[PDB]
Structure formats: structure tokens, C-alpha cells
């Protein structure tokens, strides 16, 4: 027979994954670790449409890599000290973070390095509803207990940053009018999805040819955040990075 308000330690675990591959691994040299989530607890019972302007407590947590007993690394965040970035103190009971009756909201507020926030969504299981933006649930009474409504686990899908690259070969037009082919190679420790196909380190992900101006170019979404090597396909190679979304890296000097 306790003497403290009704609370539950059964909260929510978020698993960060790559949206395009649906894998527990980042693409290129991006990360699934470091994604930040803002959690807000409210003393009342609200829905998304009538949340008060001020939360009762606010916490910012981040995804951290964890390898399970099967040897699989996941990128997990939840309401505990090991995942905390900033915010108020947690409600603690018997060495664990708990929540009293009320409303709980959570949304991704910082994409992990190499990813975008744009379009990120949560999923409780396979085929279930894709939740975009702010997720809202409550801690409600069930007999003498406090219970969190809805799923206890979600996958959080993040869109990887993508970019492109353009280049030239090194009379008049005797160099630019030649048919110069360039191979683009992955220098990444993780797979890269390029034109519907997965490529590993040192594999050629694309070949591009020079136009009548002498410029070989890719689309602005060909390559995920990552390190790449561009070399004439016959030969002095160039290493470059994709970091800004939709930007064509300019190697034409």
C-alpha cells in the first residue's frame, strides 16, 4: 500500500531507422544516433487540438546505439538519464523514470547527422498507421493502476540527405567535346541506395558522360549523405562529400 500518486514505469521506446531501406542502419556516413526527441507531460487530459500553451514538464532525449544479445545494434531513445540531453528532472520511483496520470506528447526536434526532419514518421508495427508530427497519448486509470495508452514501441523513419555532383575533363573544345565517362564510387562504411540499388564501399554506384558543353552531371538526389570518389572511366581521382540536401557539388573549376 503506497503513499504516492498513481504512476507507470511502462513508457515508450523509439527506434531510429533509415526511411528508404527501413533498416536499423544509416546510409553513407550518416548517423541514426544523435536524433533528438522533445517529450512533454501535461497534468490534464488533452488531445492534439486542445493542448495548453505550457507543459507541466519537458524533456529532450537522444538516440544512442545499443547492441542486443543477438548482436543487433539499434538506435534507441526513451525517458531515462542515459538518453537525456536537456530539460526538467524526471519523476523517479524505485530508480526508474515514471509518469503520473495525464497527457504525453513526443516529436523528433533534431534529425540525426546526415538526415532530414522533413517527412519523418513513427510506426508501432508493420502496415500500421504512419504518425507524422506530434504523437499524443495519455496515462489513464485502469482499476488501481496508471497505464500508458497505445503502443510502448515505435520505429522512427528518417529521410537521408541526398545530393549530386558535376565535373569536366582535365584547338577549342578539343577537351570538352570528347566523350569523357566518370565512375562515381562509394567510400562509405554503410550501404548507399542509388537508383533503386544498394552499393557497398569501393563499388561503382553510377557512370556519367560529358554533355556538348563538356559537363557530366547527376540529378540532385542521386547520392545519400556520404563520401564518394569520382574518376575518369578509362586518371587522377577526386574524393568529395555529399552534405547539403539537393545541392550539386561543383567539381568543374
UniProtKB/TrEMBL annotation:
Record key words, sorted: Cell wall, Membrane, Peptidoglycan-anchor, Secreted, Signal, Transmembrane, Transmembrane helix
Domain of life: Bacteria
Annotated family: Belongs to the serine-aspartate repeat-containing protein (SDr) family.
Protein name listed in UniProt: Cell surface protein
Amino acid at each position: 500500500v503506497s503513499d504516492t500518486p498513481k504512476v507507470t514505469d511502462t513508457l515508450i521506446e523509439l527506434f531510429k531507422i533509415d526511411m528508404e531501406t527501413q533498416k536499423d542502419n544509416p546510409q553513407g556516413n550518416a548517423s541514426l544516433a544523435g536524433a533528438e526527441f522533445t517529450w512533454k507531460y501535461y497534468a490534464g487530459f488533452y488531445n492534439k487540438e486542445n493542448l495548453p500553451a505550457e507543459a507541466t514538464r519537458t524533456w529532450v532525449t537522444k538516440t544512442i546505439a545499443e547492441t542486443d544479445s543477438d548482436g543487433t545494434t539499434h538506435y534507441i531513445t526513451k525517458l531515462a538519464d542515459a538518453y537525456k540531453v536537456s530539460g526538467d528532472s524526471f519523476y523517479m520511483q524505485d530508480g526508474k523514470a515514471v509518469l503520473p496520470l495525464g497527457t504525453l506528447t513526443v516529436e523528433e526536434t533534431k534529425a540525426p547527422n546526415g538526415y532530414l526532419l522533413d517527412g519523418a514518421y513513427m510506426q508501432a508495427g508493420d502496415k500500421s498507421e504512419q504518425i507524422k508530427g506530434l504523437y499524443v497519448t495519455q496515462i489513464t486509470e485502469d482499476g488501481d493502476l496508471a497505464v500508458l495508452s497505445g503502443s510502448n514501441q515505435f520505429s522512427v523513419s528518417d529521410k537521408v540527405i541526398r545530393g549530386g555532383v558535376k565535373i569536366q575533363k582535365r584547338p577549342q573544345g578539343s577537351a570538352t567535346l570528347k566523350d569523357t565517362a566518370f565512375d562515381i564510387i562509394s567510400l562509405n562504411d554503410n550501404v548507399v541506395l542509388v537508383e533503386g540499388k544498394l552499393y557497398k564501399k569501393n563499388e561503382v554506384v553510377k557512370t556519367i558522360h560529358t554533355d556538348i558543353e563538356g559537363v557530366a552531371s547527376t540529378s540532385a538526389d542521386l547520392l545519400p549523405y556520404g563520401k564518394f570518389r569520382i574518376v575518369e572511366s578509362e586518371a587522377k581521382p577526386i574524393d568529395f562529400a555529399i552534405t547539403e540536401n539537393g545541392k550539386i557539388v561543383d567539381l568543374t573549376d
